[PDB]
Design a protein around this ligand. Structure first.
Ligand SMILES: O=P(O)(O)O[C@H]1[C@H](OP(=O)(O)O)[C@@H](OP(=O)(O)O)[C@H](OP(=O)(O)O)[C@@H](OP(=O)(O)O)[C@H]1OP(=O)(O)O
Length: 251
């Protein structure tokens, strides 16, 4: 019954008066939060995630297409302001890292072909447009492209056959070409092995084997990895993967 074409427009007062007060450590990054699909679950996740760290984050409802724009918090915290799609305010242009999270649905099962119903080629092409735009504002040293959505990584396949591995090979030269202070060893793709969601406070939870949804701290105690990093190692020119949070787990 999910309507992926609902396309609820961002309510600025919802963020300022409800979500920021409810949900809001200097991160060294600008966080671009890109809502790819028009369902209300994606919309709420985008709002909630932004509202937890509103000063360094940007919302883009990419599902709005020609009407997509950057939304972000004013310097004084009293307003949600706007710029053209993927642009950022002056105060964020000196950050040395970019985190770009694509909010999407994965599938009921692991898959290697699509994220948010987008092929590697399709998402790569959008990332190319994104990179050509953010270079007008920022020249970081580090980039993470974070795929927030279920079942997009498995250690049972070669990293190069997985969607994040394929995506990294597809985009890495565009990243280093456009963002000249980013080298290959400073690009990572974030991906999930398990189902994930953003809770009503803007925190990521993972669906454990028990059927319980668990937060960051509980996942670590449970020895369950909520996010993998996929990266390219120039030393042997191979794609690799490792767990972000679980010291032992790697490709
Ligand atoms: O800084 P990142 O590498 O992008 O990771 C952040 C970071 O987690 P850790 O530094 O503990 O690994 C945030 O923690 P803080 O900076 O706020 O201390 C946490 O947000 P929470 O405070 O809510 O735990 C967030 O998690 P979330 O996805 O819930 O925004 C998580 O990002 P990742 O989940 O993508 O690793």
């Amino acid at each position: 019954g999910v309507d992926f074409n609902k396309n609820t427009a961002l309510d600025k007062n919802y963020l300022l008066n409800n979500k920021i007060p409810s949900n809001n450590g200097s991160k060294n990054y600008v966080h671009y939060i890109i809502q790819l699909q028009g369902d209300d679950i994606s919309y709420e996740a985008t709002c909630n995630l932004f509202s937890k760290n509103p000063k360094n984050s940007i919302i883009i409802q990419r599902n709005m297409n020609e009407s997509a724009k950057s939304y972000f918090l004013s310097d004084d915290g009293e307003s949600i302001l706007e710029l053209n799609k993927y642009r950022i305010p002056e105060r964020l242009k000196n950050k040395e890292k970019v985190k770009v999270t694509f909010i999407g649905h994965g599938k009921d099962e692991f898959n290697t072909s699509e994220f948010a119903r987008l092929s590697v080629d399709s998402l790569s092409n959008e990332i190319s447009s994104f990179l050509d735009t953010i270079k007008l504002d920022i020249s970081p040293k580090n980039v993470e492209v974070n795929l927030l959505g279920c079942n997009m990584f498995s250690y049972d396949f070669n990293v190069e056959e997985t969607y994040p591995g394929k995506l990294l090979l597809s985009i890495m030269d565009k990243i280093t070409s456009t963002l000249p202070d980013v080298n290959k060893n400073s690009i990572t793709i974030g991906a999930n092995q398990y189902e994930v969601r953003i809770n009503s406070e803007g925190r990521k939870e993972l669906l454990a084997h028990s059927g319980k949804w668990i937060n960051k701290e509980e996942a670590i105690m449970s020895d369950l990895s909520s996010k993998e990093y996929i990266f390219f190692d120039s030393i042997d020119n191979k794609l690799k993967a490792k767990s972000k949070n679980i010291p032992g787990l790697a490709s």
